[PDB]
Amino acid sequence: DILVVDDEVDIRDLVAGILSDEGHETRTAFDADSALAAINDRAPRLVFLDIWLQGSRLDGLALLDEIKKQHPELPVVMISGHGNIETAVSAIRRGAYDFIEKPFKADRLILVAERALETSK
Amino acid sequence: DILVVDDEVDIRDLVAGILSDEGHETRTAFDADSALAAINDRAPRLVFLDIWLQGSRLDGLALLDEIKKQHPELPVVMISGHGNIETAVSAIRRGAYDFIEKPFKADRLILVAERALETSK
Ligand code: BEF
Ligand code: BEF
Ligand SMILES: [Mg+2]
Ligand SMILES: [Mg+2]
């Protein structure tokens, strides 16, 4: 199972769509509280997290920290157009499996998801 | 005890100089085989690694892999002007403690060195 967290509908749909077409059951969330509620209901096997979450209680990096604190075993991959070297290093040090830069190619998204799912329940 | 690995003398001198002035015993190496020889002789407490090592048998990332294989406990920090998000993510996933972008400020270098030395022998 994959949970995609992004404040933009077009990105949630584009990511869930690409992954669903490859045979992965994908759910979406639009902010930190909808993401945490979706994980607390039934933990997915992988989480894709945006960083700049407009109107969210937590940005994607604080959300990564909260997810990794409750579920250290749950792989989390960042997907963001707001990265730089310092931000990507911070994400990996804080527990993210990988960092996908926006704009991404479909095969890169699938390659990373399947690598992370090999490291999941 | 810090080992600085860079193919450029001006960078080896600039990094060893800044760290020596703060009271850290620093040694230098110019390529993968001089770095591995220095480590095998006596393991340092921290290694600073450049990535593009002109004339070296291994680039800095392959050298990071070799160092982390023999000494998983030895902190390694990348210092490079050849980084990007994918390269920095790769370095942290492969065991680097942190990634310092060139050009760097002296206080950033010292801060990162002292954080990594807190995690060393
Ligand atoms: F809004 Be995300 F960090 F691309
Ligand atoms: F030659 Be290094 F990667 F700045
Ligand atoms: Mg966003
Ligand atoms: Mg170089």
Side-chain angles (χ1 to χ4, degrees):
Chain A
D1 196 78
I2 303 166
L3 174 71
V4 181
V5 186
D6 197 292
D7 59 318
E8 288 174 72
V9 204
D10 251 61
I11 303 293
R12 290 192 307 267
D13 292 355
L14 208 256
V15 177
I18 290 164
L19 293 171
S20 299
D21 289 0
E22 292 306 300
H24 305 290
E25 293 230 39
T26 55
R27 282 193 295 162
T28 70
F30 54 87
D31 72 348
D33 293 307
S34 58
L36 291 174
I39 291 160
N40 285 323
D41 139 67
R42 52 160 284 181
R45 290 170 63 222
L46 166 66
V47 181
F48 282 108
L49 235 46
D50 183 37
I51 292 168
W52 271 50
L53 295 165
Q54 279 200 83
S56 183
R57 183 174 57 87
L58 303 172
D59 57 66
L61 292 160
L63 180 53
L64 168 68
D65 296 336
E66 184 56 33
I67 296 164
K68 292 267 86 162
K69 180 177 180 174
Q70 297 152 329
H71 296 103
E73 73 290 349
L74 165 57
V76 181
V77 168
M78 308 313 292
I79 304 178
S80 178
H82 291 272
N84 49 222
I85 289 165
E86 195 174 4
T87 300
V89 169
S90 184
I92 311 304
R93 282 226 108 236
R94 285 155 80 172
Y97 179 76
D98 206 345
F99 197 109
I100 297 175
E101 296 168 69
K102 287 179 196 172
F104 55 80
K105 289 273 171 277
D107 293 325
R108 170 87 191 151
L109 175 63
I110 305 154
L111 166 69
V112 174
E114 294 188 350
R115 278 175 171 168
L117 287 161
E118 205 253 293
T119 81
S120 195
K121 61 179 178 184
Chain B
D1 225 307
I2 304 174
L3 177 68
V4 183
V5 187
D6 197 292
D7 59 317
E8 288 174 72
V9 204
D10 252 60
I11 302 293
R12 288 200 302 276
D13 292 355
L14 128 102
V15 177
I18 291 165
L19 293 171
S20 299
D21 289 0
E22 292 306 300
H24 305 291
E25 290 182 340
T26 316
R27 280 192 296 162
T28 70
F30 54 87
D31 73 347
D33 294 308
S34 58
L36 292 173
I39 290 159
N40 286 303
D41 193 275
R42 185 179 75 178
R45 291 170 64 222
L46 166 68
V47 181
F48 282 107
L49 234 46
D50 182 37
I51 292 168
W52 272 49
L53 295 165
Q54 279 200 82
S56 183
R57 178 172 69 82
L58 303 173
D59 57 66
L61 293 159
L63 179 53
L64 169 67
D65 296 337
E66 185 56 33
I67 296 164
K68 292 266 87 162
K69 180 177 180 181
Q70 297 152 329
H71 296 103
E73 73 289 349
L74 165 57
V76 180
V77 168
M78 309 312 292
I79 304 178
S80 179
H82 290 273
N84 49 222
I85 288 172
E86 191 175 10
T87 300
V89 167
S90 184
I92 311 304
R93 281 218 287 220
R94 285 154 81 172
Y97 180 77
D98 205 346
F99 197 109
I100 297 175
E101 295 171 68
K102 287 178 197 172
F104 56 80
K105 288 274 171 279
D107 292 326
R108 171 86 192 152
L109 174 64
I110 303 155
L111 174 156
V112 171
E114 292 186 359
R115 277 173 177 174
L117 287 162
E118 205 254 293
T119 81
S120 195
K121 61 179 179 185

